[model samples]
Target: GSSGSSGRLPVNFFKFQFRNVEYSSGRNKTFLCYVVEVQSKGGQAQATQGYLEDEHAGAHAEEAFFNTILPAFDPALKYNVTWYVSSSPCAACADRILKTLSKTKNLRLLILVSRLFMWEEPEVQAALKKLKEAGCKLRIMKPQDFEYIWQNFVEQEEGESKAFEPWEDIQENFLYYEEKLADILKSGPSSG
Candidate 1:
């Protein structure tokens, strides 16, 4: 009764869902995927919360999470949420996230991204820096992370779920995005 997409089971993910080279191009032109998990502080298992099930087309996935998913939890209980997103957030969404962090003391967020969204722009890079400053840990996704998502987040058909496989340049791409994120974080002014 709680299904979001027409109450029918969402289709399972494709083979290379997480670390695909398709995200390398400037214009991804693809739906963004967000896999969310929230756990109790100090790592008590909290699988009570479920995950997103469909490809996102209109709003930035993080933006949608702000209005949709973020409200599902109780603000009195402190929890840590991790996100595996197809791309880093856009400018407005980043601003909203920081604003949310300022008001909401109960949640800590970690974003592991498969690729940056327009890292060449100063605004996007600066947004990443601001998020880092707000106690939101942001990092590039690794090959192993792809497998983890596959095993955990992906909804497999009966006996049809397969292990995640890495495509070529997955590690290389990780390093590049990792280096870029670190580069941005270090370049920012301290205490701002």
Candidate 2:
């Protein structure tokens, strides 16, 4: 059977995996491969043609690009392949990704499950505390504000429309909350 010299899955597929792949610096600087697998009656095959272009610049920027743009391009694509300057990994880069995830609620959960380094980044510990604190404050204020607003504006005989204008604001607030988290992950822990 096809296999690499080490007697593993040929993985020769990696060579031809991503033809459209875009590198941050240049074609050779870094190339991304498709993160997928396919099986057929003949044999297990995989598509090795795709590209992940950088959406931003700077260190670990590719991670951000992978997180944001890739999903938009093909939500069906369940995996991603990224090749960068070094394998050592930078905390700042991880933090930047975390900021992005934190801002986008769905993205945050995505990363959380992917456990893509950001989950292990040291800064995430600090960030979690801050986010928890902020979330708690918002939750506390929400109840008090809802009660106060209801008392002042809501009448005993409410209609099907509901007795709350703040409902819209609440929705906006949650949206912002998720947005904030995303922004934080994108910008890095140094960001507000």
Candidate 3:
């Protein structure tokens, strides 16, 4: 093995590590999903309320947005389609999402990612920037966000623990992702 100066994280690199976890990004093997909730730009009527999982063979949760909830949208009306994703959108999904975004001026896409999928990749950074400049409001989800999604999205169980159970360093992780995403959108190089 040759030893040289290189500054690249592993393909499945995560800053934090926990015990009994074998999957990358500190997540489930097949838990990556996109939860899209569509409502009026203000606090009016809700449009589409559903979840899309990325556990399928070929189809991505991002791809699922095109067929199901998109057609119901009105042309002249405005909507706020909020997406809670288990992982950030991949390059291909970002491109497809952007294509559909260009087709609709009345719809504003808001994406909240849980984790950065292959965040070290150049294509991933580029995709995030493309979405950012296109007016997509994106950031990591907070605990309040978690409880809301849990109440609306999750199935209730028989146990007494009905509310959300937060993992360790939940808020800390939010801050970490905050800086990372900001840097991705910064487009750093020139300084005055």
Candidate 4:
């Protein structure tokens, strides 16, 4: 099964291979998978989404991004997630979708932009704040110290005229440490 109570969810400690979807909307959609290993991030998986019926539906993948993954995170573990994001929606709209999904508890949110254009916009910061206000965990997805990737992306798009105020250094410093949880994912039990 999955990470939720719904039979639609894969069983605990699941792993799945990547499958590409060519949609009628003329977009190439790739569903990046999540593997829940039984042994604290490393183990032979007992189950996987690759075996699920209709698991490859692009819509289901989007829903999983918000529901299955977000609300179930424990704040004490280290995570390295690589999501394949597309332009079916803009970055702000994507952020808004996540905010909407988390109406109940604190949804641990991570916005990963595979194309890099998502990092340069000021609206992205606003999107983070919006999710934060909505009581969601909004972490900037800069995997493996992506500073150079972000800078190079911005430089390539220098001719474009979109801008936002520079991020506030002081504001960035105001993270809720919840007990010194640096860049690692806090683990214990899944809330689902």
TM-score of each: 0.70, 0.25, 0.71, 0.30
Model 3 lDDT per residue over 117-175, tens place: 66667787888787777777788877568566555544444453466556676878788
Residue-level lDDT for 9 in candidate 2 = 15
How many residue pairs collide in each prediction? Answer: 0, 13, 0, 15
> Worst lDDT window (10 residues) for model 1?
1-10
Candidate 4 lDDT tens digits, 27-93? 3334333323222245432332211222443434545544555334433333333332322223444
Residues 96-179, candidate 1, lDDT per residue (tens digit)?
Answer: 777766666677776787777676677877776778777777889777886665555555677675665666777898898888
Candidate 4 positional error at 99, Å: 3.8
Q: What is the C-alpha lDDT profile of model 2 across 78-150, one tens digit per residue?
A: 2322222212124453444445444443222222110122434556545544443332111212323433223
Candidate 4: which stretches are off by over 4 Å? 1-27, 34-61, 64-96, 100-102, 118-129, 137-140, 143-192
> What are the Cα lDDT values of the candidates?
0.61, 0.33, 0.60, 0.35
Residue 3 in model 4: lDDT? 40
Comparing 1 and 3 by lDDT, which wins?
A: 1
Stretches of candidate 1 above 4 Å error? 1-20, 23-59, 72-75, 167-170, 188-192
Candidate topping TM-score: 3
- Residue 96 error for model 1, in Å? 1.0
- Model 3's alpha-carbon lDDT is 0.60
